[PDB]
């Protein structure tokens, strides 16, 4: 279905002598593929997925030069923000950016994104029209007028409609057999007395990729909506993920409950039950 | 390829 590219950028100022740390991470279909970190010994963009090994040295050199430019842009911007909010000079402050594009199967731009946050709060964003800005507070109004005056939206619109789209296309072609890879979940149910005559049934899914997955519990053909605990999907650390969902049930009825596991890599959704 | 910002904040 859809495809996406994003670059997530962070600059964090530090009270000491050090310049802010600037980190940029690129994503294609939610998978990290490049990263730049100013704290590294030799700061440069690096590949973070195998299929990016296809790009030549000019790609990395010029993207690195771009990051260096961004790094200065974020430094200037952070100093401006200190002034806008009349903040004191001995603190730490975070500026973030999210940019990118969503595509259709036919390679049309569905939606472009260019937005910023300061101190974890939305600051300013380019509207879906790619021409106007939504500013969240008084400081952002200053930025908004500067950018309206200098016609900044036209430059971002050009990037989002052109380069973002065109490079995402190229990356998807290069990462075809690599992006399609899946690991199916392996699932099982565990049984945990906790009783006022009750037990927790916990349905586990392990070793799966990508992270997207749905776990359901049911009783006698009905989905169980409430009283069901669902942990955030978590990385195993080896490139696979884990998740569980649990329900509290009456002692003696455990066999009546079934868990279902839906995942892309599967041929069919898994269905399972506590097996004593 | 990554975006490049124009006028600063």
């Amino acid at each position, epitope marked *: 279905g859809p495809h996406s590219m994003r670059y997530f950028e962070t600059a964090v100022s530090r009270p000491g002598l050090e310049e802010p740390r600037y980190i940029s991470v690129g994503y294609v279909d939610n998978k990290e593929f490049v990263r730049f970190d100013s704290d590294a010994e030799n700061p440069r963009y690096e590949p973070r997925a195998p299929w990016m090994e296809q790009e030549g040295p000019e790609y990395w050199e*010029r993207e690195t*030069q*771009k990051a260096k*430019g*961004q790094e*200065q*842009w974020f*430094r*200037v911007s952070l100093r401006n923000l200190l002034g806008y909010y009349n903040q004191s000079a001995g603190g730490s402050h975070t500026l973030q950016q999210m940019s990118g594009c969503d595509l259709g199967s036919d390679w049309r731009l569905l939606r472009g994104y260019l937005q910023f946050a300061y101190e974890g709060r939305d600051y300013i964003a380019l509207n879906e029209d790619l021409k106007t800005w939504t500013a969240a507070d008084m400081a952002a109004q200053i930025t908004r007028r500067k950018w309206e005056q200098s016609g900044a939206a*036209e*430059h971002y619109k*050009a990037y989002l*409609e*052109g*380069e973002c789209v065109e490079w995402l296309h190229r990356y998807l072609k290069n990462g075809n057999a690599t992006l399609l890879r899946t690991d199916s979940p392996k699932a099982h149910v565990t049984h945990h007395p906790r009783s006022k005559g009750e037990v927790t049934l916990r349905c586990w899914a392990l070793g799966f990729y990508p992270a997207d997955i749905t776990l359901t519990w049911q009783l006698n053909g009905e989905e169980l909506t409430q009283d069901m605990e669902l942990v955030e999907t978590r990385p195993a650390g080896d490139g696979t993920f884990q998740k569980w969902a649990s329900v509290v049930v009456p002692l003696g009825k455990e066999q009546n409950y079934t868990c279902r596991v839906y995942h892309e890599g599967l041929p069919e959704p898994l269905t399972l039950r506590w097996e004593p | 390829k990554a975006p*490049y*910002d*124009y*006028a*600063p904040i």
Partner: T-cell receptor, first 112, second 110 residues
Framework: AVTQSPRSKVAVTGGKVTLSCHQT?????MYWYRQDTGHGLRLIHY???????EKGDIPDGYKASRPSQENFSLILELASLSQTAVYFC????????????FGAGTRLSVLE | QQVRQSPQSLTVWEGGTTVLTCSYE??????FPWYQQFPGEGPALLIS?????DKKEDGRFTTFFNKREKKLSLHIIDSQPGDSATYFC??????????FGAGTKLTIKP
């Protein structure tokens, strides 16, 4: 505004020369360019922050100094005949695509 | 040198249309500002255009961009004396530093 000082300078070969630039634009980037018989804008040095500088395309024979956000100077320690030229300072908001705003030029003649 | 600008000097008759052209080597260059420099002054941004556009018109000045030829041009219609100046084409990719051509000095003589 971007204002350069002096407007014109005559110097002896092997003499020290300092060309000054003052910008009131609150811009962080500053540049020194060289123009020859009315042609070219060749970057000598630039600076994106109030105490360091970076080499441009033709830095040899010149040093640069950024003592302040408003001030960027070009230094010729031992002026040579080859440095007879017109020098232009510029400022920009954040480099890259941001418009460069230029001073009016300083003509330097180096004589024996 | 990445931006090639010829000729060194050009004269065209008052009222005529000047065509100034430049070529570039780097096919990735995507922003193209022209700067105008009057005698005794510094350059100032005249007009600019992005790679996504074919032309940008402003009054009597029009920039054209030709991706396939890797050519820029500036057209001045009804060329008048006050337009005589040095015109610099320029080019960059992304946020990289600007590269200037050598400049063409234009004479509008009546």
């Amino acid at each position: 505004a971007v204002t350069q000082s002096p407007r014109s300078k005559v110097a002896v070969t092997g003499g020290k020369v300092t060309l000054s630039c003052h910008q009131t634009n609150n811009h962080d980037y500053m540049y020194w360019y060289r123009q020859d018989t009315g042609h070219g804008l060749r970057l000598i040095h630039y600076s994106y922050v109030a105490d360091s500088t970076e080499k441009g395309d033709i830095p040899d024979g010149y040093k640069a100094s950024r003592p302040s956000q408003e001030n960027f100077s070009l230094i010729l320690e031992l002026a040579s005949l080859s440095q007879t030229a017109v020098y232009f300072c510029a400022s920009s908001d954040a480099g890259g695509r941001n418009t460069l705003y230029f001073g009016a030029g300083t003509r330097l003649s180096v004589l024996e | 040198q990445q931006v090639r600008q010829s000729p060194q000097s050009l004269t065209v008759w008052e009222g005529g249309t000047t065509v100034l052209t430049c070529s570039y080597e780097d096919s990735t260059f995507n922003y193209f500002p022209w700067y105008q420099q009057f005698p005794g002054e510094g350059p100032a941004l005249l007009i600019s255009i992005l790679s996504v556009s074919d032309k940008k018109e402003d009054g009597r000045f029009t920039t054209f961009f030709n991706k396939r030829e890797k050519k820029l041009s500036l057209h001045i219609i009804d060329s008048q004396p006050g337009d005589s100046a040095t015109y610099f084409c320029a080019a960059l990719y992304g946020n990289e530093k600007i590269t200037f051509g050598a400049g063409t000095k234009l004479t509008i003589k009546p």
